[PDB]
Design a protein around this nucleic acid. Sequence first.
RNA 1: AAGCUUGAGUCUCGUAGAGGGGGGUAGAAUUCCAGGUGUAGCGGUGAAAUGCGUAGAGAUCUGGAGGAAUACCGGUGGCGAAGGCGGCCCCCUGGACGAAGACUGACGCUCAGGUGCGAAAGCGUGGGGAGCAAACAGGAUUAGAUACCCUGGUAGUCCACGCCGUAAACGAUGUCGACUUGGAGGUUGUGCCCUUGAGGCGUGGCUUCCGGAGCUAACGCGUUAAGUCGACCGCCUGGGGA
RNA 2: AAAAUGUUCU
Lengths: 100, 56, 271, 129, 65, 88
Amino acid sequence: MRHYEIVFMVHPDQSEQVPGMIERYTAAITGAEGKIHRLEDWGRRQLAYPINKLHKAHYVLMNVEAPQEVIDELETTFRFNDAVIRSMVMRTKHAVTEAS
Amino acid sequence: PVIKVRENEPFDVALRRFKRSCEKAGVLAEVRRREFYEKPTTERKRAKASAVKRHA
Amino acid sequence: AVVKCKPTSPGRRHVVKVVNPELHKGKPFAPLLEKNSKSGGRNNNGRITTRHIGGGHKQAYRIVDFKRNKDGIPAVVERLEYDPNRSANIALVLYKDGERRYILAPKGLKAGDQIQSGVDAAIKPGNTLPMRNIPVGSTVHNVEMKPGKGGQLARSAGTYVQIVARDGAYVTLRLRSGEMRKVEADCRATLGEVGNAEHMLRVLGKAGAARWRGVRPTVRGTAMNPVDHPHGGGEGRNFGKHPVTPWGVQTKGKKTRSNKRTDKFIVRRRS
Amino acid sequence: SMQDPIADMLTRIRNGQAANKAAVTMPSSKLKVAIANVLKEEGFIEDFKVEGDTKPELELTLKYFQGKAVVESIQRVSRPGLRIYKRKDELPKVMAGLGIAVVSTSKGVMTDRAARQAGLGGEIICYVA
Amino acid sequence: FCRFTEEGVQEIDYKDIATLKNYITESGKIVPSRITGTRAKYQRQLARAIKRARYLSLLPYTDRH
Amino acid sequence: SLSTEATAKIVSEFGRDANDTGSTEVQVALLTAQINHLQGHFAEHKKDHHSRRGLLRMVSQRRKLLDYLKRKDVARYTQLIERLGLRR
RNA sequence: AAGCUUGAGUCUCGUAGAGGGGGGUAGAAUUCCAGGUGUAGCGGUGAAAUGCGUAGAGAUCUGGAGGAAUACCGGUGGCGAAGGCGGCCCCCUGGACGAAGACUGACGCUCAGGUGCGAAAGCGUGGGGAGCAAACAGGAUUAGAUACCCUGGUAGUCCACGCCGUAAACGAUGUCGACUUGGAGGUUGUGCCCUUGAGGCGUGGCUUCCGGAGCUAACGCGUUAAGUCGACCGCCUGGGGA
RNA sequence: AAAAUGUUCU
Ligand SMILES: [Mg+2]
Ligand SMILES: [Mg+2]
Ligand SMILES: [Mg+2]
Ligand SMILES: [Mg+2]
Ligand SMILES: [Mg+2]
Ligand SMILES: [Mg+2]
Ligand SMILES: [Mg+2]
Ligand SMILES: [Mg+2]
Ligand SMILES: [Mg+2]
Ligand SMILES: [Mg+2]
Ligand SMILES: [Mg+2]
Ligand SMILES: [Mg+2]
Ligand SMILES: [Mg+2]
Ligand SMILES: [Mg+2]
Ligand SMILES: [Mg+2]
Ligand SMILES: [Mg+2]
């Protein structure tokens, strides 16, 4: 059960939905008996360049200890969802609980 | 090489600064490099030559 | 797989058989069969309207579900089957309510896989949702042109349609020809590419095979006399006129679309 | 791989001679030890020490007469890829008897002269000059 | 003078843009190791981090948009 | 390459005592297991040539080990092959 | 026949890496399309012309489509058996190296025939096709110009699965092993040390440069040898013919 | 930008 440093940025108008989404993700992770070692909502940050066609995006750092299938599912969801703009699942050695 | 003239500053000086910035970037040089296609082999050879030169 | 036949006879030499062992080796689901008699390319007036059609082999029409109305009810695929009436294979699917329907088999789909139609349905090959719900970028097939009508685009062996944009109430489809086409976003579209893509690699190998399919020999204009076809006559092999149909219309390049009703929907013509 | 130990030893000795090494060490062997002993007897090295129980290291102390090597040359004649066995009559002599041929014989490893005296020969292990 | 080594870090963080954007020039280009005096391994890691940032749009690829 | 737990299990199966990890038989088993694991991958990924090279090497090593076993003691080898379902 | 642990492997924990395969995506740029702004050039070269342009080009902004390649990092830097491998992310995956220790116990090395991989071009079927570009065309240049320059421009380059099986596929240096003075680096481990500070002292792996002995026809090579030896294979016997 | 060649044997 490897670790995953996920960082995804959500469309700034959909900021009200973001917490719910996060919760859902957490549930999913736990559904297949995995941990969520940190979860930092950075909020609406100024982008260095405009992704899609907007200048601010609502960032969500989230670190996981989960299986592969769940991660795949998450990725799929991200792909589907127009709310999220960019995601970045990363593999990470260690639990990396500390704050950024 | 983005520049902007600050309050109370000559034109010439600004221009010079811009030029310096450009040089630092390596924009003109880069452009030159990309004017024509160099074969990877050729590039490698060039690199080697440069390395040799550096060994003074 | 594709199977190049050994040349034990001339006629068998050039044959490439698109074999597909997952297809059901048996009689198809009888309720969904209906009679489909051959025409010979002949209308109510008895006249050969379309040439080079006839003989063939007796076929039973498979009532293939192109509309996909069973919303919410998931369906397991029982078996892929051979449909003689199309280049695609047809998956027989068992909906949990009890109903069995044929669908165009998608690419990845096979026996045991689940499919689903409607708005709630998940994005995975074989599932059918309105193109408002399907994401931009997706390769889809069995696309409806009017909502509720039935899938009319991308039904052939290995075809699909890229959903390329969604400008309001219309999605833009990059059709398999290259024709960019506005279709209403309410129109359904089955996720995935229709799955028999090796179909095109099959080579009949002989005239007989063509005949079996229902394709009577095509005599070339130039082979005929002037009375029958514009490219007619000439002592020896002459052909001193511009390629035309049997009815005199130019055949190399002359565009024959003159719709105007649907030019609104055509974003960019194929090329 | 280490497909000739004696040869390797010889090479090491030669290299030591070349480079002015006071001593030359290697993995010891019974045959090797015998060879060393023979060399000592004949005059080309000072002393050999077989130091160790599980892994014994043969450590030869090389000679340097007048600032140059005593071992002028040291070639393996017999070698794994082509063995050389000489009868008593056939037995070689290195530099017309101003240098030795270490020969392995039914009665021990010894210089060629010794073998001749005995009335036997065998595997001419190495010419040492 | 390599800073990362001094610090005693296992890996450079893409999220730590404040550190990274000292090692990228004004135009957005990744600054050389020879100039900054970074260790080679660290430099590679740093570069990777920068790339990640760019992808996520914390740092810019170039100074145009 | 091979999961630690799996390796341990293999060792337990084949090696006489838990630390007996170099035992020819154990090694063979490890190789065999690894090969099996890789087979699926190779089926999936036919053109992964570099990876296949490693696999080939492993196979060769296994064969060598088997050969070594055979001459030292045939019965053991016979047993081992039966256990593994190695063709020969 | 019995052994032993130095060779050769296995396991423990880490390590760096453009190693390979599969799949996602990112931004810059070129091209094309649509639309706006605007007006006589643009483009090109040695200079020209062909070409594109008053039907509105080029320039300039906006939106889109696509394909290919991944600036900077980038380094006689790294990894890979060689070929080669370069954005980032994931999944599968091979090797290498180190740290100690534990285990096997010569299981090794080399290898004709054989098998596999093997750049680029090329070929086969199906896709794709922006840029580049054999062929081809026109313009130049020219004495001629079947070229170099320019403008275009198809196959090809891209992908999928096959075939091809060769290159100055080179380090023009077969593989494995041992040994022999040094220096300057690079890279990547690791043990020790008041890290009193970026350091100090080692010990390994891989690697560039100089250079000693020695070798060499000299050039050079020179602890990664072309030195000193050993094992195995490959190949050579004047040039042309070939 | 453009600059081709040099009869044989001594
Ligand atoms: Mg017809
Ligand atoms: Mg025909
Ligand atoms: Mg005909
Ligand atoms: Mg006739
Ligand atoms: Mg007529
Ligand atoms: Mg005629
Ligand atoms: Mg690995
Ligand atoms: Mg023992
Ligand atoms: Mg090619
Ligand atoms: Mg050209
Ligand atoms: Mg021409
Ligand atoms: Mg091709
Ligand atoms: Mg050759
Ligand atoms: Mg080279
Ligand atoms: Mg050669
Ligand atoms: Mg040198």
